[PDB]
Structure formats: C-alpha cells, structure tokens
C-alpha cells in the first residue's frame, strides 16, 4: 500500500504527460507567424501619486476606473481619486506589516492583510462619516499573500500555510478550504465569471480550483522557481504566470499545457506582477530591475518599456476600461501611465 | 487648477490637504522610534529578553510587537517565532530595522537536538546566525548577540567538556576560556566585517544591565549611521 501507490501515481503522471503531448501539433508562435506586430508601444506618466512614506506593497483598481486603493509599509491604506490626485480616504491599520489589499466590486468595502494572518474588512460607507473595521477574518496559520472579493459577502484569500480559503464575511467563518499545494501560495486570480480561480505557489506549480465544489480541477507546471504573480486572460480560457527565474509563461485551460514563454537573455531579475490589457494583446510585467516591460502576447516580442521608478516595482494594475496602467514601487510613489 | 474648480471641488482639495498634513505629522512621529528585530535561535531568551524590559503599550497569531521606553527613547521589538513559513518571502519586510537581537543559549551545547538525530543545537544556532548575518537585506544592519544561561553553563561545564561540541577545541575547562572560544567562533561567521559590528553580551546577569547594553549599542549604531551620511547638506 506504499510502493504500489507510488508506482500507480508515477503511471498516472506518465499517462498525463503522454496525453498532453499527443494533443500538441503546432506551436502558438507558428499559428501567429502571419499576424502583424503591434509595433512600438510608447507610454507616458500622466500622474504621480505622493503621500506614502514607505514601500508600497499592494494596490487595486475600483470598478469605476477612477478610485484606487494602495497599501504601504507604514500602517496606511490610502484611497485616491486618480483624475485629480486627491486623497479621498486615509485608513490607519492596527498592524503595519501589510502585504495585500483589495477593492470590493461595489465599492462599499476594502480588504487588508499581511503578517498578522488576519484579513480585515473595512466599511467605507458609514453614517458616522468615518471608516470602521467591519470584520476581522482569522484562521490562517501563515501570512496573508492575496485576497479578492467575490461579492459584498464573500472573499477568497491565500496564505503562506499552503492553503487557500473562501470566507463568509457576515459570519466570519471559513466556508471552504482548498488544500493541494506544497509550498506557500503567493498569488491569486479570479475568473471573469467568478466560478473558479487560479493560484500560484512556491513549489513552481499553478492550480485551477472550483469555488462551488471546493476541489482541485487542474495542475500546471513548467516554471523553475517560485511563482510570484498570476493573472487571467480576458477571455477566461487562459492565464499568465510570472516567476522568480525571469520568465513569464502562458497556460491554456483547455489545451492543458503551456502556450508561450516570454523571456530575454538580458533579463535576469524576477517578476513581481503581471497583467493583461483590455484586449489581451499586451502583457505587462513588473520586474526587480526597477522598470516594467510590455510584451506582445501573441508573438512573445517585447513591445515597450516603462522606466520611471527608482526602486523595485511591486504592484501593477490595469483599469476595467483599459485606459491607464497604475504601477507602484518600493519608493513611496504610484505612477499612472497612458 | 485653482480658478476653474467648482465649489464642491475646492472643499475636496482642502480635505486632501488636511489628510496629507495628518499623514506628514504621523510619519514624522513614527521616524523617531528604534525598531529592533528579535530572531534568536528559536528565541532562547523566552523570559529574560522579553520580560526584563519594562514594556509599556501605546488561527495562530503572527508577528508580536512590544513597546517600551528607556531614558526618553522609544523601542519597538518585533518577534517572529510562530511564523512557520519560508523566511526568504517575508524577511525583506524588515530591511531598515535599527538592529537585530540574536539570542543564543550557550548552555544548550551538550543537548544534541529534538525531533532529529546526529546534530547539535549549537550548530543549528551557528547556521541560523550565518544565514541571517550574511543576508543581502542585512548587509548594514548591526547584530546584538545575547548569550543566555551562563549559570547553567558553569554548572554543566564541569561534568561535560566542551570538546563534545567543538572537536578542534583544546584548552582549559573553565568559564572564561570556554566563553571566549564560543564567542570567537560565533563572531568568526561574519564574512562582512566591514560596516557591521557584533555586540556580544552575556545576558544571564538578570538585572537592569540588559536594557542598558541595548541602549548603548543602539546609540552607537545611530551615531555611526549619522556619520556615515557625510553630508553637511
């Protein structure tokens, strides 16, 4: 019951690899060998948001594409109006070791978490005129790496204890727990239909789950180091992962294998964040060499650079309407590019 | 953009200015504190280090914060011992602390290990010290090395020689020689002797000298950092 099970697992792995090898006839680069390149992408910094006094660790965009939240190492969450660079809200945190933040799709709440293993839900629309701590979700045994809202009542979080959870905010109890990973889970991304999500962990693997069933659906490998970022394709049938070996990869849900690899010889630092444009043609990745890169998704050629930061680029996001790109850094400044 | 604003936009700008002023005041208040990171070889100073300091405060839990004040100087100690995760993922969050307090129980040299075989707990302490001291994020941060339980070390050293831990050791079996050898071996793991100093101190006095030693080391670190700036402007 020990060696036989291992042999059966090895046979299943060999069968899976053979099945996914038999389904590959031509590469995506071969298919896209005829389409015209996007050319050269030039972006300019239209706005710089100042006011933080430490390293910015996370950011998120509102669904109205105007308000954005940022989290800094000093115990602050700042909610900014991007058009006028006005600070709409400043929220002090009980614990200053914050690693992630999220914006509710309705704009009523914000989320926070970090080294305290707690996800704090803050209510913005209060009759008293202030911002309160609506809820405190506890139960993870490791630091909080990511959190994303499903609706005003549900939120999915990932932690460093190799598990992910789906919570009920009104009760504070863990509704579902996903536990299949081996290393710390670092990233999280919800599908546009919000029925399934993908997580990337330090064991160089990505897993596709099911929110309703609470069980693992698919597993993807190929990276040679920890996976720091993950993002869904706008269609919902693919995703992109950024890792610590200075390489991004595109995986397809239906093909069940890799499609393209985005890497360059003169790129050696790891990727901290990835994002897709509105159409999915451009892939934006933030690096540790202080500047971001814009890649042609369908051709795997670098299309542009975003170099305006003096330190590592930590957070990166694209608006719902795809008009601007907001990038944070380990200096105290956020930049909006157009 | 001061004449084309509406009546409701000038009030929003004023609110933003007030928020920025409060942020500046709180950020200048938070820059006058001394932040120390307490790592230890499992934090062998479970009682003396975190109880001797007169702490006043201003589903397992994660980081633990302790506040105290000594001679009109505020100290915040951060302890991360219950964080059972990859260290290389959250250790860069502490880049910029004033000092790192490393606690080692030198009385735990005869004990081999727990839940393992054929190893020494002292060797694990040295491995952790080597990993932390030569970290890329801590190339400048200074280390205060506390050595605990010196009374038990003297009580036990008579029965068991120090050669059980260090095969190459050759000397007397008294307090001073063994302590000097252990201190030298611990301080010989510093491969970056420049711009980093180790402040060793046998802490088993169980008196008010621990906070005094921390205060002296912190003051020396701050003054060396100030003189490192080398800028009249």
């Amino acid at each position, epitope marked *: 019951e020990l060696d036989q099970l291992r042999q059966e697992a090895e046979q299943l792995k060999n069968q899976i690899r053979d099945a996914r090898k038999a389904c590959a006839d031509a590469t995506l680069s071969q298919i896209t060998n005829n389409i015209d390149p996007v050319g050269r992408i030039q972006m300019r910094t239209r706005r710089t948001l100042r006011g933080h006094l430490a390293k910015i660790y996370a950011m998120h965009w509102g669904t109205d594409s105007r308000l954005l939240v940022s989290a800094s190492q000093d115990g602050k969450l700042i909610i900014w109006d991007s058009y006028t660079t006005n600070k*709409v809200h400043a929220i002090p945190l009980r614990s200053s070791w914050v690693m992630t933040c999220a914006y509710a799709p309705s704009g009523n709440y914000v989320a926070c978490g970090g080294l305290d293993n707690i996800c704090s839900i803050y209510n913005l629309k209060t009759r008293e005129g202030n911002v309160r701590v609506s809820r405190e979700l506890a139960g993870h045994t490791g630091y909080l790496s990511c959190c994303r809202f499903l609706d005003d009542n549900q939120i999915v979080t990932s932690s460093g204890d190799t598990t992910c959870a789906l919570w009920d905010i009104e009760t504070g109890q863990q509704t579902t727990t996903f536990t299949g990973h081996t290393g710390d889970v670092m990233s999280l991304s919800l599908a546009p239909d919000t029925r399934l999500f993908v997580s990337g962990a330090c064991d160089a693997s990505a897993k596709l789950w099911d929110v309703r069933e609470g069980m693992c659906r698919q597993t993807f490998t190929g990276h040679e180091s920890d996976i720091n970022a993950i993002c869904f394709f706008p269609n919902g049938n693919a995703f992109a992962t950024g890792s610590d070996d200075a390489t991004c990869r595109l995986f397809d849900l239906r093909a069940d294998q890799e499609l393209m690899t985005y890497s360059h010889d003169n790129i050696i630092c790891g990727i901290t964040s990835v994002s897709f444009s509105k159409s999915g043609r451009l892939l934006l990745a933030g690096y540790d060499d202080f500047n971001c890169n814009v890649w042609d998704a369908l051709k795997a050629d670098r299309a542009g650079v975003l170099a305006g930061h003096d330190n590592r680029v930590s957070c990166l996001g694209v608006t719902d309407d795809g008009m601007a790109v907001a990038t944070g850094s380990w200096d105290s400044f956020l930049k909006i590019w157009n | 953009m001061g004449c084309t604003l509406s*009546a*409701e936009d000038k*009030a*929003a700008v*004023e*609110r933003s200015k007030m928020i920025d002023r409060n942020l500046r005041e709180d950020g200048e208040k938070a820059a006058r504190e001394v932040k120390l990171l307490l790592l230890g070889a499992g934090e062998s100073g479970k009682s003396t280090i975190v109880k001797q300091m007169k702490i006043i405060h201003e589903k397992t839990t994660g980081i633990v914060e302790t506040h105290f004040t000594f001679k009109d100087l505020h100290f915040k100690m951060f302890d991360v011992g219950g964080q059972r995760s990859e260290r290389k993922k959250w250790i860069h969050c502490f880049e910029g602390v004033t000092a790192i307090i490393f606690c080692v129980a030198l009385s735990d040299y005869d004990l081999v290990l727990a839940e393992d075989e054929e190893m020494n707990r002292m060797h694990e302490s040295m491995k952790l010290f080597d990993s932390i001291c030569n970290n890329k994020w801590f190339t400048d941060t200074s280390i205060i090395l506390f050595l605990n339980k010196k009374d038990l070390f003297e009580e036990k050293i008579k029965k068991s020689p120090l050669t059980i831990c260090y095969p190459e050791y050759a000397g007397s079996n008294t307090y001073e020689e063994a302590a000097a050898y252990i201190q030298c071996q611990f301080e010989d793991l510093n491969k970056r002797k420049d711009t980093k100093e180790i402040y060793t101190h046998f802490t088993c006095a169980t008196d008010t000298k621990n906070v005094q030693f921390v205060f002296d080391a912190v003051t020396d670190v701050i003054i060396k950092n100030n003189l490192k700036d080398c800028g009249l402007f």
Partner: single-chain antibody, 233 residues
Framework: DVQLVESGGGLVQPGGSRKLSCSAS????????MHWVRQAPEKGLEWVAY????????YYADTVKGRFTISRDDPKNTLFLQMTSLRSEDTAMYYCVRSIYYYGSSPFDFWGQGTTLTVSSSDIVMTQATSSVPVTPGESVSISCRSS???????????LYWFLQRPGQSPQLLIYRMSNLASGVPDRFSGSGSGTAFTLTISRLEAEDVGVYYC?????????FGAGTKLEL
C-alpha cells in the same frame, strides 16, 4: 444615532445680541463642514453661514455679513452663531446642517431640529413657478425647477439638490446632483433634466409625501433655494 440639537433662541429686542448653539452627537463632528440655514415664518429657506472642516474657510450671506459670526468647538462638539444688532427681518427658525465633501459624497444629508428666534417689532436665482398642485394618492407628479445660469460644470457635474419638508418637520435630502437618490429614500422618487431645466418625478404617490419641495443650487456661493412647491391632498 446622528443628532444635532439647537438651542439659544428666544425673544430679543431690536439692536440686541444673541448666541445660538448647535450640539452634535453620533458622528465624527470634526470631519463635516457645517451650515446655518434659516426659514422665515410662512416663507422659504435661506442659507446664512458656512464653516469648513478645520475652520479654514468661512462664508456668510450678504444679508447677515458683518453682523453675524460663525465658529466651531471641535473637542466640545459645538457650533456657535453670534448675532449682533438683530433687525426685524431676522425673526426665523434656524437649522444646523452638516455636509461632507469628497468624490461621491452626499452633502446636506442631515438637518437639525431648528430653534426659533423672534425679534420684536451675480447670484443665481432659482424659479419654482408652480406654488401648489392638487395631488390624488396613487398618481404620478412632476415638479419643475428653473435656473438663470447653467448648473452643468465643465467636469460633468450638475449641482442641483432636491429637498423635502413635511408639515411640522425639518427638511430632508431627497436628491443630490440632480440624479442620485439619497440613502433611506424610496425608489419612487427620481430626478432628471438638463441645464437650467430640472424635474423631480414621483411615481405611485403614497401618504406622508405632502409638503414643500425645494430645489437648491450648489454651483457657487451664496447657495440659493427655490420658492418651494407645495403638494397637498
């Protein structure tokens, strides 16, 4: 439990002085700008004074400028209005209104209860032509408001507010910025219109809806109210 309670009103001989106080309880008083608004007997509403958050901006109406002073005490949560040389046209009921200004806020959302002062014996003009209409329950009604200047700003905001005052009650905010429904307001009410022509529509009229409806502009100071349209039956 948001509460604003006014006090200090009585009978004053002409040429005297009087102080009105407004005490707030149940909300963050320091974060709200505050207004004093008066209503003459059997007449409409009239804006009097405004003080910002942090007291950095103060505005008065030309009728009361020079003779009236407005102030706030934040630690005590109080708002003061000092009036000197009280003429015979200052006999009215005074309301203490709170308003907060940021992107997406709802100003003028809470009104006080009012205190009665009885003394012994260019600006944008808003027109509410219809003084009163007969209304049957269950029908649909429309109230029209007109302006002498275009309230549509260059930033895309139309600064028109609809308030309702029930008999023997304080005014309440129905609609802000011509389209947004205030919290606690049923879905029956709606607002629409274009520059210098706005409409407030009530569908399936029910009880506790009779009273006076006012349209106010917030494009630039001074803030001017309408004459008020009365719904009866």
């Amino acid at each position: 439990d948001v509460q604003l309670v006014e006090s200090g009103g009585g009978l004053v001989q002409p040429g005297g002085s009087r102080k009105l106080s407004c005490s707030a309880s149940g909300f963050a008083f320091s974060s709200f700008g505050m207004h004093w608004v008066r209503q003459a007997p059997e007449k409409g509403l009239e804006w009097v004074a405004y003080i910002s958050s942090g007291s950095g901006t103060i505005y008065y109406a030309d009728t009361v400028k020079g003779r009236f002073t407005i102030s706030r005490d934040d630690p005590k949560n109080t708002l003061f209005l000092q009036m000197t040389s009280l003429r015979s046209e200052d006999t009215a009921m005074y309301y203490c209104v709170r308003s907060i200004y940021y992107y997406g806020s709802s100003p003028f959302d809470f009104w006080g209860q009012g205190t009665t002062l009885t003394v012994s014996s260019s600006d944008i003009v808003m027109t509410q032509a219809t003084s009163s209409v007969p209304v049957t329950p269950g029908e649909s009604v429309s109230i029209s408001c007109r302006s002498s200047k275009s309230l549509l700003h260059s930033n895309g905001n139309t600064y028109l507010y609809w308030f309702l005052q029930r008999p023997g009650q304080s005014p309440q905010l129905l609609i802000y910025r011509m389209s947004n429904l205030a919290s606690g307001v049923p879905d029956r009410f709606s607002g629409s219109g274009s520059g210098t022509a706005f409409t407030l529509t009530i569908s399936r009229l029910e009880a506790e809806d009779v009273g006076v409806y006012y349209c106010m502009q917030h494009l630039e100071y001074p803030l001017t109210f309408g004459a008020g349209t009365k719904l009866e039956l």
